[PDB]
Design a protein around this nucleic acid. Structure first.
Ligand code: SF4
Ligand SMILES: [Mn+2]
Ligand SMILES: [Mn+2]
Ligand SMILES: [Mn+2]
Ligand SMILES: [Mn+2]
Ligand SMILES: [Mn+2]
Ligand SMILES: [Mn+2]
Lengths: 362, 95, 553, 340, 95, 340
DNA sequence: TCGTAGCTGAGGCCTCACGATGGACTTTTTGAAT
DNA sequence: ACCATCGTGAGGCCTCAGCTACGACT
């Protein structure tokens, strides 16, 4: 990352156009709850009801996620290991239960400084500050740009605006990170509370939202199911990314390491929650991708049909492969590439090669 | 920057035919009775090139690889009269 | 009997381009390009096959009539309706097209609307209420209805009038003023609008050439004992019962049969059916015979050709210009291509005023016998000095005897080469002038004796140095042809198979060598130059232009 | 004159040259000769074979080889590069500009037509039963009409009286049927040559005219003549004007004839026709049966162009054109039409 | 302006195979076991297009025509491992 | 502690869960159970099958499933996303920075090595014939060398005396042969660990060390530990530092052993070796025969890590690492090495 | 329930050599382009 | 030395279904 390391390494120049993508594939999503994954030579065939549903060219493959009760041939697992393609296991709802590792990652100093960071309270405090500030700044951006009123709501209510702006101010004025939890919760509460203000230009049929039903494991709402799904299923992406760069995705600074939720990546994703998960939910709902009949009721709550999951994952994938412009480096780059570049930049900041971590605020 | 390729083979050995065959499955998609469409990048086109000089037997088999182009605007270059052609698409497979 | 009924698409084209209409009807000269062929293809598969008949008595039924013959006694026109859609007694024309819906008001340009209106009136004349039709675009598969206006009918009838008046006039209507309409008129290859304008003295700047379309390459059969056989649409040449080669018929454009080659009658038939010209040449290349096909469509071209042929002054002036151009090309070749090693590197300027005074005397020729004299003198000096550049001087056995012109079996290597090149170019010219409807035999200056068509014999003289001489020089200097390449005999110097192979190859390349037109200043092959000069001559015969461009470099 | 045309039906034929002689072979077994003294055009039917040496010698002797299908379909001539044809063609062109040559020539062809017409009246007048002999006053009117032609002062006059006498002739053309009116196939005296056929009689007449003109075209091109530059009709617009001028006198003996057998012998029936908004068009089967019938007409031999030698009409065409050449170039005067 | 084309066929009828086969001989040159190289212009590419919709039987055979490009710079787009490829050249045939 | 590892040789095996129980099946016929109380890593050999439900339950119980070839070749673990491992790993990292923990731990592993070495001297001293009993002064020197270790003031001192005592040991390592010097296969006391092997004895020693380190790597990763961050060796540059620290005490019982059967039982002979500019490299056949011999070493069972339960060395590895975990996080003090 | 890589069979493309039925030709108009 | 498209066979591609072996490995 020479241009970037220079430009942030404060010997100011202008970063040049990106050296493009090379040697990167596409992920493998297995949502069909009763599919059977088998290796044939270098091809990988997915079959359901003993019929060849599809196959993926192994080289073009880059990741594998196994939702729910899908089946993997041991040989296929071996093959993936030999091309050290990461593989992950997800609950039927998408709970991130397990994955594989391979003899650790080659680097060590990266992890070493990662832990040194992990044991400097002030570094952790500052990083959490910046993370949540970026998060609520992306809430700035999404809220006002994407607000859909028909007339006299078309502009976001400016009381909200200084509301959240004072929130960012308090955020950098957080003395410790418990106060940071409090600020985080308050801002997020207002944000979700107002969230309904744009989807379809207002709630649809059965698409009503209950903002209290966050922190609530089996979702009781359609939109809550969608949001939790998007959150958790993004989380996997982040986990893979940080594993690839030698970081221990579990050793976090702000979030704390409990099951199914890797602490460091849990931290890492917060700025991207609106740009990625929220954006996708909005896209699908407004674009009529997902409707009331798309969901299934249960005592557990709102769950997704096969067609729902099909299409939701497809949209999310497209969002990954949606190009944007880096605010500081001002060139087109996929969100997915952004993941690695942010990761490696973090690494460098841990190594002290750069003064401070870029938080990617839009 | 991504390109599309079309490959045709004539082989005179069932052994080599097997090997070449599903190694080719490793690279593209079957399209015609002895032809595969192939949407690839430089690194793997070179990998292809390497594999098939060496499964294949030179003096006496024959294979052809044809770069149609960038594969954004392929079908302006293609015409099918049997089943309809439409090229490879890169999305993750989600089934 | 001055004029029959006018075909309706001839109206269609007329408002499109009245000049084009005059050409396409009064003399015809149809031609094909991308869109013409495309439209023929889309029309044929459905509409060429017939359909339901138009009932004389119509009470209550659906009519889906296809390929209907209607013609009007009183209107003065004739039509084949592309399709008829009618409910009982209210019928409607249906036209098919080839492209998209045009991005114009009403989705139809003026001309096709004139089609619909006019042949709808034809339907009316036969006792029908049409009042409108439609345009069925085949590609976008769409119907676009057309209502029959009043002044649209006015357009139709006035166009009828002015067709009749321009036909009775007998006058070439002018081309479009630099219109985007021509560059796909599919006859710009024969309209030559920019050229006709620019020489037609309404000075503009001619635009870059509309490129080559629908042209093939010739067939040369020099192997004196080759067999030529048809297999399907391919044509195989075999010698000693082995498949020497084959040529793709479509890509073929001409056929020349040297010496004692053999042709399967079937192959001849096939060539006729694609009216590919075929010619017969002696083993030395004497131009003995070719084929014709029921004459050429045009007549006025030949008519004015003969009128020219019987005006002594026109002939005199044209011969003047021809020979002047010839010796001017001798100017150019001589000085540019002279090879001296030192103090010859510049052409001796005495030669220069020598030939320059020659051109002066040439335009000061009172009659053409004096023109023969001047021609002979200048050519004598030119050949006499000819040796001054080849290989930078004569080679081994490549010495030249300029007296051995006018001497049928050549006694020299170089004379054999030169006569061969001359005669074998002559064939090219003959084909070209035949293709444009000119009678290649009725000349003005040269006189029609056997094996040497008079008009083309005239026609070639300016090109003798640029083509034949240039090729001879290229082959000799480039070491293509050497002493061992020739065979001695009492007859003289003749060519070996390898010699003929390579000499023809070089000559072909010279044909496919691009140059720049002095007056129109764009790249164009010598071969295309042949046709363009031919058609320009035609126009000059028709009087459309003031004088013939002689193409002096 | 010079010679006579040579025909070779055989798709099997192999022809070479015996010095001054052309030799026809069937299967290396020998058939006929031309031997080149009295030869004219060498016509070869479908996939007939002739040696290149024979072709070259033919070219040297300036003889127009031409090519027919096995069916007899013409598809091309072959011409040597000699002063035979242009001399004729140039003669044709200046003598074309000369008016009273056109006058004389025209009124010969017109009287030739009309005399042939009345001769045909008495060859095939089928008003029998009570009128085996045609109305006499018709014939005084006609023989007057060839006189009317022989006075002809100018060309437009000639065409006017032409149309008059032709309508005259078609008035009684119905009597030529095989005993009465041709109900189901009726003839109109006034819808003549109206472009699509409004009557089956007109349809057959038009198609017969089409091919007759077409054979005149091919025969005319066979000799060194240009068919599209006529002395009487108008040249431009695709019309073979000279062919049209030629084809007049022989409309009766051939086209009108071909119609008369085709109808009186039952080859042509009612169902063969299709009516379409004023168009009586034939069926392909009827077309080609009629075509065989036309070949039959073409196959009969008449003997006296100027000499007894019993030629089919087709060779009479070449003879006629060559006699026209004899007329042009000031070789014989006044072009003595064939009339029967 | 001249272009080069590559055509591949899979046909399920010996009748159609014959017809298509040597009609194809009418257009290009045999290059591969069921492939012809084709150096053509617009008019005759359309003529081709017309002929083969209609010798061929649509639902159930399959043919492909591939415009490589202008045919001045083809071999930058081609690679052969059996016999060497070099495209069609337009010269008059003089043999 | 918690439990013990479970092995399933069978390429045939089909495993599912019985509530709290894991059930092994051969051909729908039933084999074994784990039943999850005293379970540790679930290791599956080549193409062994276990149901996804069983896998999920395993993940919930935070148990490191791992994967071996049918040959027994390791190629991957599978880890749940739980606080089992990082807790251990973070403990590892701060306790890694602490120096005298490193000191204590190191000098345990060093004495463990060297005591094992002398114990091996009296397990396999083959100086018989006149010296079935090894030189005593060697052993006073040694037992002094574990004392020398137990005083150890600092790490570099520890490594220095390490090298001294190790060279000491290799001086008499030749006596371990099956009765004399190993002519054709001689041992050098000073070319020790020189990177390519200059003696076949050194070659076999190095390869045995390679795989021993490698199994320590896999077992170490099996538990929630990082093998590349060591307390004694140097971490960077690819060296698995913690694995190297672990593998010391067991060089004798396994690698030195594997060599001793491989040579004294004639599996290893002269011709198996290739000499190359100072390199005594084995042949693939010799390699893999030696590899089977190493598996044989791995297959013997010793019983007393801290309890009689007669485990193969391989499960002792997991037991040892888990006891290390027990030491870390301040659960048991001072990590009681296995020594025999 | 080892699961997959490799090998046999059987059908169907694909082309050629060598054979054998017999020997196309239809009046005229239409046919693009901006 | 009547020609040239048309139609059969027999071999050689081309792929698949169905089998049998073995275990990538340092
Ligand atoms: S250039 Fe074409 S469209 Fe224009 S007047 Fe001439 S023939 Fe007509
Ligand atoms: Mn093939
Ligand atoms: Mn049309
Ligand atoms: Mn001259
Ligand atoms: Mn008349
Ligand atoms: Mn094929
Ligand atoms: Mn050590």
């Amino acid at each position: 990352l020479p241009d970037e390391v220079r430009f942030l390494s404060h010997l100011s120049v202008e970063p040049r156009p990106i050296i493009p993508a090379d040697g990167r594939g596409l992920p493998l999503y297995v949502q069909s709850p009763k599919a059977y994954v088998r290796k044939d030579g270098d091809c990988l065939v997915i079959e359901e009801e003993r019929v060849r549903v599809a196959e993926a060219r192994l080289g073009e493959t880059s990741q594998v996620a196994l939702f729910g009760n899908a089946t993997l041939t041991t040989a296929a697992l071996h093959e993936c290991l030999r091309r050290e393609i990461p593989v992950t296991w997800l609950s039927y709802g998408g709970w991130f239960m397990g994955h594989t590792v391979s003899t650790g990652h080659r680097n060590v100093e990266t992890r070493t400084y990662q832990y040194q960071r992990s044991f400097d309270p002030e570094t952790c405090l500052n990083l959490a500050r910046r993370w949540i500030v970026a998060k609520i700044a992306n809430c700035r951006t999404l809220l006002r740009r994407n607000w859909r009123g028909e007339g006299d709501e078309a502009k976001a209510p400016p009381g909200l605006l200084m509301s959240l702006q004072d929130d960012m101010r308090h955020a950098m004025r957080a003395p410790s990170l418990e106060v940071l939890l409090g600020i985080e919760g308050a801002s997020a509460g207002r944000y979700f509370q107002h969230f309904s203000r744009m989807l379809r230009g207002g709630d649809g049929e059965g698409m009503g939202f209950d903002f209290t039903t966050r922190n609530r494991r089996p979702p009781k709402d359609p939109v809550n199911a969608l949001l939790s799904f998007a959150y958790a299923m993004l989380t996997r992406e982040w986990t893979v990314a940080l594993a690839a760069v030698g970081l221990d995705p579990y050793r976090g600074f702000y979030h704390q390491p409990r099951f199914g939720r890797p602490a460091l990546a849990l931290d890492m994703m917060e700025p991207f929650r609106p740009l990625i998960a929220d954006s996708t939910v909005l896209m699908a709902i407004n674009n009529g991708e997902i409707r009331t009949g798309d969901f299934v009721r249960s005592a557990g709550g709102c769950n997704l049909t096969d067609s729902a999951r099909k299409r939701f994952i497809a949209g999310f994938e497209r969002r990954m492969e949606q190009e944007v412009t880096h605010p500081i480096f001002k060139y087109t780059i996929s969100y997915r590439r952004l993941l690695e570049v942010q990761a490696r930049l973090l690494t460098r900041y841990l190594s002290g090669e750069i003064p401070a971590y870029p938080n990617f605020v839009t | 920057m991504e390109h599309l390729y079309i490959v045709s083979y004539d082989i005179r050995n069932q052994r080599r035919w097997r090997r070449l065959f599903k190694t080719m499955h490793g690279f593209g998609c079957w399209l015609q009775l002895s032809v595969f469409q192939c949407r690839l990048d430089r690194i793997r086109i070179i990998k292809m090139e390497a594999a098939i000089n060496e499964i294949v037997n030179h003096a006496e088999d024959h294979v052809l690889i044809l770069d149609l182009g960038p594969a954004e605007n392929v079908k302006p270059k293609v015409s099918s009269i049997g089943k309809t052609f439409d090229p490879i698409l890169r999305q993750a497979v989600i089934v | 009997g001055s004029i029959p009924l006018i075909p309706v698409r001839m109206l269609n084209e007329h408002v499109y381009c009245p000049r084009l209409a005059y050409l396409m009807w009064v003399q015809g000269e149809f031609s094909h390009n991308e869109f013409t062929v495309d439209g023929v293809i889309r029309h044929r598969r459905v509409d060429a096959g017939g359909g339901v008949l138009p009932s004389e008595t119509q009470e209550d039924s659906r009519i889906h009539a296809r390929s209907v013959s209607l013609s009007s006694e009183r209107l003065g026109i004739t039509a084949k309706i592309d399709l008829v859609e009618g409910e009982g007694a209210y019928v409607s024309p249906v036209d098919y097209k080839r492209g998209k819906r045009p991005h114009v008001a009403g989705g139809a340009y003026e001309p096709e609307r004139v089609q619909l209106c006019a042949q709808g009136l034809l339907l009316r004349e036969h006792g029908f209420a049409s009042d409108g039709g439609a345009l069925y675009f085949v590609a976008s598969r769409e119907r676009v209805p057309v209502a029959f206006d009043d002044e649209l009918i006015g357009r139709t009838l006035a166009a009828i009038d002015e067709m009749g008046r321009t036909a009775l006039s007998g006058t070439m209507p002018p081309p479009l003023e630099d219109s985007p309409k021509c560059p796909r008129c599919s006859l710009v290859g024969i309209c030559l609008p920019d050229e006709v304008r620019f020489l037609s003295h309404l000075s503009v700047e001619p635009r870059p050439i509309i490129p080559a379309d629908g042209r093939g390459l010739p067939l040369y059969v020099q192997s004196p004992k080759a067999y030529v056989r048809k297999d399907g649409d391919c044509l195989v040449i075999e010698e000693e019962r082995v498949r020497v080669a084959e040529a793709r018929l479509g890509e073929t454009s001409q056929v020349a049969l040297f010496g004692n080659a053999t042709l399967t009658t079937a192959a001849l038939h096939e060539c006729l059916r694609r009216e590919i010209p075929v010619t017969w040449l002696s083993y030395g290349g004497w131009f003995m015979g070719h084929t014709v096909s029921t004459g050429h469509r045009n007549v006025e071209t030949r008519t004015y050709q003969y009128q020219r042929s019987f005006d002594p002054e026109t002939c005199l002036n044209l011969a003047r210009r021809w020979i002047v151009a010839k010796i001017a090309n001798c100017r150019t070749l001589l000085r540019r291509n002279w090879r001296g090693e030192g103090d010859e590197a510049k052409a001796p300027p005495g030669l220069l005023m020598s030939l320059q005074d020659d051109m002066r005397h040439a335009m000061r020729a009172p009659s053409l016998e004096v023109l023969l004299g001047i021609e002979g003198a200048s050519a004598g000096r030119y050949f006499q000095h000819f040796s001054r550049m080849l290989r930078g001087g004569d080679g081994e056995g490549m010495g030249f005897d300029f007296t051995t012109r006018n001497r049928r079996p050549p006694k020299d290597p170089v004379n054999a080469l030169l006569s061969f090149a001359y005669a074998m170019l002559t064939r090219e010219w003959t084909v070209a002038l035949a293709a444009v409807g000119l009678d290649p035999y009725r000349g003005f200056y040269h006189q029609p004796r056997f094996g040497r068509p008079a008009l083309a014999l005239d026609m070639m003289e300016p090109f003798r140095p640029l083509i034949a001489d240039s090729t001879v020089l290229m082959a000799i200097n480039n070491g293509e042809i050497r002493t061992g390449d020739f065979v001695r005999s009492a007859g003289g110097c003749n060519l070996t198979d390898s010699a003929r192979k390579r000499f023809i190859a070089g000559f072909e390349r010279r044909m496919e060598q691009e140059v720049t037109h002095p007056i129109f200043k764009y790249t164009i092959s010598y071969r295309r130059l042949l046709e363009v000069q031919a058609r320009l001559l035609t126009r000059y015969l028709s009087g459309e232009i003031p004088a013939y461009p002689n193409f002096v470099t």
